[PDB]
From a paper:
Human [name] (hBest1) is a [name]+-activated Cl− channel essential for Cl− transport in retinal pigment epithelium (RPE). Although the structure of hBest1 is still unsolved, two Best1 homolog structures, one from bacteria [name] (KpBest) and the other from chicken (cBest1), have been previously reported. Here, by electrophysiological and structural analyses, we show that the neck and aperture in hBest1 are both indispensable [name]+-dependent gates, and their dysregulated opening by rationally designed or patient-derived mutations causes [name]+-independent leak and elevates [name]+-dependent channel activity.
Alanine substitution mutants for each of the 12 residues were generated in KpBest and hBest1 and subjected to crystallography and patch clamp, respectively. Moreover, the equivalent KpBest mutants (W16A, G18A, S19A, L259A, [name], G264A, and D269A) all showed an overall similar structure to that of WT KpBest. The corresponding “[name]+-binding” sites in WT KpBest are occupied by Zn2+, an essential component in the crystallization buffer. Interestingly, the KpBest [name], G264A, and D269A mutants show no Zn2+ in the corresponding sites. Moreover, KpBest L259A, [name], G264A, and D269A all have relatively low resolution and slightly altered structures in this region, suggesting that the binding of Zn2+ stabilizes the channel structure.
Numbering used by the authors:
A (entry chain A): 22 to 294
B (entry chain E), E (entry chain B): 22 to 290
C (entry chain C): 23 to 291
D (entry chain D): 22 to 289
The structure:
Amino acid sequence: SKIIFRLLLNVLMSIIAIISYQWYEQLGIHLTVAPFSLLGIAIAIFLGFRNSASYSRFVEARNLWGTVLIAERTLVRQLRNILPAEHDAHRRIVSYLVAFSWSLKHQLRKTDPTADLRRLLPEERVTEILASSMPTNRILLLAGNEIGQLREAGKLSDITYGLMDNKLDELAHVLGGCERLATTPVPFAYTLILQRTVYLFCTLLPFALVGDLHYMTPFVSVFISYTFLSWDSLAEELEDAFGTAANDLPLNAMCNTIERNLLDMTGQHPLPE
Amino acid sequence: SKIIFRLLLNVLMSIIAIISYQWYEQLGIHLTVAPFSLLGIAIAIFLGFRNSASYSRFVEARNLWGTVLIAERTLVRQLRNILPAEHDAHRRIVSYLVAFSWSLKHQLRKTDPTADLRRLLPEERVTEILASSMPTNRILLLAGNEIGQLREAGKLSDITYGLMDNKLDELAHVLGGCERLATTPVPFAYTLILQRTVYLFCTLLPFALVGDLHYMTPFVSVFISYTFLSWDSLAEELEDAFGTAANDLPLNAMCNTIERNLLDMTGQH
Amino acid sequence: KIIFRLLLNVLMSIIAIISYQWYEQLGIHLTVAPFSLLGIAIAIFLGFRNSASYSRFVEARNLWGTVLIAERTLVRQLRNILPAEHDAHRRIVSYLVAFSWSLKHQLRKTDPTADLRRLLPEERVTEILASSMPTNRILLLAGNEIGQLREAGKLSDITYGLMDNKLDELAHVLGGCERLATTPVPFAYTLILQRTVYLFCTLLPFALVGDLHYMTPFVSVFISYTFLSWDSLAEELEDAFGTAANDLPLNAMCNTIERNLLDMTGQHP
Amino acid sequence: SKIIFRLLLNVLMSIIAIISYQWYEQLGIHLTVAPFSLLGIAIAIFLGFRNSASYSRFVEARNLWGTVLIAERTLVRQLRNILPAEHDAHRRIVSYLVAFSWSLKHQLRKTDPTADLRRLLPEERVTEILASSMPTNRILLLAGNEIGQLREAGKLSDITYGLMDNKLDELAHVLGGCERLATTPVPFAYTLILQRTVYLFCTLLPFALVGDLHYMTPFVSVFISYTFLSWDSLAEELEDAFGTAANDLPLNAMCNTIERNLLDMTGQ
Amino acid sequence: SKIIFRLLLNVLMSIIAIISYQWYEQLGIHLTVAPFSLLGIAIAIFLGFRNSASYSRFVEARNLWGTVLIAERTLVRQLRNILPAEHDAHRRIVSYLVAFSWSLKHQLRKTDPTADLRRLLPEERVTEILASSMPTNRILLLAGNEIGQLREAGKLSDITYGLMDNKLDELAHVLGGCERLATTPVPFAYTLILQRTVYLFCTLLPFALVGDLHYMTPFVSVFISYTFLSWDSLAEELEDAFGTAANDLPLNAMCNTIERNLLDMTGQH
Ligand SMILES: [Cl-]
Ligand SMILES: [Cl-]
Ligand SMILES: [Cl-]
Ligand SMILES: [Cl-]
Ligand SMILES: [Cl-]
Ligand SMILES: [Cl-]
Ligand SMILES: [Cl-]
Ligand SMILES: [Cl-]
Ligand SMILES: [Cl-]
Ligand SMILES: [Cl-]
Ligand SMILES: [Zn+2]
Ligand SMILES: [Zn+2]
Ligand SMILES: [Zn+2]
Ligand SMILES: [Zn+2]
Ligand SMILES: [Zn+2]
Ligand SMILES: [Zn+2]
Ligand SMILES: [Zn+2]
Ligand SMILES: [Zn+2]
Ligand SMILES: [Zn+2]
Ligand SMILES: [Zn+2]
Ligand SMILES: [Zn+2]
Ligand SMILES: [Zn+2]
Ligand SMILES: [Zn+2]
Ligand SMILES: [Zn+2]
């Protein structure tokens, strides 16, 4: 945590305010609580509204990765109920849906997806995915091909295809939502204005409190600084949700759960009497 | 009250603040209202936003369990309307749908679902559901198999199947919603950090209010503490509705309400 | 209703005026600054409470709005697809009107027998009252009317599906309305704030008397009026469907629904 | 602009507080800023939440009238794409949909739609619509008749009818939405509490401020009054959210845009 | 940023406050921190609510532009799945959809769209687009005609047409949503009330702050003037997300992303 260094600096800023208190009126400088109370309340309001915006983006990030689990379950679930005999079709579609989860993971984590794609799909398909400028959207097209080919075979009617097509439409809203959160953040000015005001408020606070507290200055100033800094750092963990930090989503575990889910519903060996 | 231990501790610290006030001039330590007022208003704003997020989680929690009630009612309604003669199918689907509700209750609470599943389903399926790592999802698959088998027999058309399949999707959106809302740790320790900030503000407050109130310190300081601690403990309850430390009554009720409703529709009681 | 405490607030202020000459005699200090910090905190918590209460009232009004929308569109679809089947029209409308009235009685926790016998044959009223939830039975009986027209050959599976969607939407309303009635916003919400504001407003003139002297009862009743009126509005918005001053006129709403559905069929009330 | 008359009243109430300040010690009355700070902050919190609720109902009114534009554009678009030859059908439905837009406007504004209805529709239909107690709903039923009769002619299938029916369902949600906003206003308590409080706070404010500010009282008190009254008046206009005021929705401009769009798509 | 000018002018106003403080009791002028504190907190609350509503407009504008990508991705995807042989049909529809994004961008910015329309579509169609009052809605009708004529031949059934029809309905919701934000912004009172109040508070702030701070008056007044004006400017920027400012949407880059998505490898699959 980088918060603890700021707390140690707040103690140092408090002690230098205590010893230099003699040279205050000799220069003619005064700092009271009431002007800093107005500034602090203003900052406490603005931080609250920013953290609300940061939480709302984190909820949206959590919701979209929840939908990957829902849409892929229901698509395999529909496949098992409508076409219970097409087991060769199942394992092809399943492998694409697992691959979609892993490729979406690596797209948000800015990492190479080649290892996971080769683990799940044949080399003719991995080359096709990597050729595309948008690799994860290619997978949905290739998964869409498999549902389309079953409709082309006559195994799926236009109604049963339409029921399965809507699940792929849900999956497209996941990818488009995840890309939108990754590319467009909370406008940088939000974090730039507040982080500047908080740090400058926390350092100038013991100088404003030294006249009222005298010797209790380091104990109180830290306790006020801690409240304003913890709330500021809370938003700095929620805004970026697709990284590898403490509050950031465990996407490795989530993709493992999806892989476990889709190989739980399938994998049941057909025709053992 | 649960927090009444900390309320009497606040009065205990107030009496300490009165007697030790004589020693304050020996080190040159002073505590005015204005520094603790700025901190107090700041905490009050931060508790307001946190409680709003806690309420937001609670409303969505009840909405999902409302959809369990809605989707299962409308699935049984569609079965009676489209296929009025197929009572053998009715009994099986209702058995699975109620088994979905109870298994979801035991999944959110992390409790054993074996006793409830054995009551509603035969042992061939109970072992199959318990073998799966996702038991509630397995029930939806088996419920989907019942709708799917009526389609393959020729009794359900592709459109009438589609109407019933959408109701199974609603329950699957709930399961995925409930799984997400229970297994998310939205803070690292900030649910405890903000709780600790309230605690230490409450205990240091009588030392700050002793100069302005003297003997009225235990009266006013406990009344400020009460308003802050009650609002903090309220957000603690609303954040985890599907908790082991949370009330079991609203979750056990809606599982019985759905069982009572589905048995009434088919005409069994 | 709030005037009973507004007169009590002036009476408590009179006590604060006469006892001010005994303040330093008893040895008590009460400054404005600690009560300012507490009062701002309460104002924040009431601000979030009233906002949460407003969202309940909006959702409750929206659900009853959807009854009027869904039933209009169901009759509209019946007239466009099957213009000849007026025997179907009159039966379904009488069910949809009965659903609205039984929804009113369910939320109010009252007997619906007086309104059900007015609209429906006696055998159906006995069947409706037999069920655990009367409204869910009506939607099932209205669904059977659409279902029997599908079995006759007059409605295809597609045209059944369009009419079925509105019956699904009405069941989402029923599940929504039941949720807002059966699950109130947790116990503590009113237990904290209502009693906190009462104890704040009565103990405030004791703190105000040091700075205001004889203007104490005039300014204390000002702050009390603003705090209590915001408190009372939030309780009127939370609850709900009943017979309070600021609540939904459900008797007038059900009459508007009945008049709309009779007007579309070519009938006069 | 009710504010400018009230701002001059506040300066006039401030000068009373200055001249009667010599009488304060005689009556035994002392007024500090600190209790009025507590009250004013509370008012500012409650005004902030009310204005938030008022803006939310304005956005909802904007979104519903946005849906009028979208659902009617798409229904005409669906008609041209499925049935490119049936122009006799187009002329009636477009005129019905435009009549829906104007009838919804006149129902919300509480004005007579007779002049607009006879401008678009034949006398056999206008007299039938005006006969109905819900004239905007009557248009949706007659618009549904045109889609329904195209289905019964064998020109529209059950599938293509269902795609068009969803748009009529979407416009019916708007009608029920707009009626909900009109018949049920923002609880009159919100206006009864705050407006009484804001006016009484601003009037009583210089009497507490005169003890600390003296001759700067009419400058400071009028600037606090301006902030509190401007925010209250803004929330008042957003609460409606319709009507004839300048701050409200330009519904005449919107209905003409809908009328122009549907006549553009048909080539008229 | 125009704040840097108003920040430097705020320091100059603070120098006037320092030199004139001696003459305060001579001129008969008293200015304390407490009334300006009450005013400043009130402004900070109203700025907090405005900035939140401003951000909500920015989010909804981004969400609609996100939908442009998603709805067009799937519309081409469905064409690449249902009709994989119709390659000449693909390139015609794709070109309309790329033209839809660019024509939307130029409509919201109020600039000439002819330069980008010629780049993507034939001259017989570009003139038909420019002839219409709403050029972006005309493109949806022209792209819809391509889907409609494939149904006319019998290549698409009524069901598979409906799947593609829903996607063009989704794009029309973006068109109406983006117009709603652009044609009418926030009420003009919102901007004119706050921008008058914020700076007139900031200029009159050092005159009230001089009594407590003396020589530190320009340091603290520029701090508060920074925090209040930076929040007002951010709110003013985000309200018009379709403008050409720093915190606004990069709509030029977004349309290039849509173009590269729909033309994945010159329209191949
Ligand atoms: Cl398989
Ligand atoms: Cl049965
Ligand atoms: Cl509807
Ligand atoms: Cl009829
Ligand atoms: Cl639409
Ligand atoms: Cl025409
Ligand atoms: Cl035409
Ligand atoms: Cl889509
Ligand atoms: Cl191509
Ligand atoms: Cl000086
Ligand atoms: Zn299989
Ligand atoms: Zn979509
Ligand atoms: Zn049965
Ligand atoms: Zn789904
Ligand atoms: Zn004493
Ligand atoms: Zn509807
Ligand atoms: Zn009839
Ligand atoms: Zn449903
Ligand atoms: Zn035409
Ligand atoms: Zn003709
Ligand atoms: Zn007339
Ligand atoms: Zn192609
Ligand atoms: Zn639509
Ligand atoms: Zn000086």
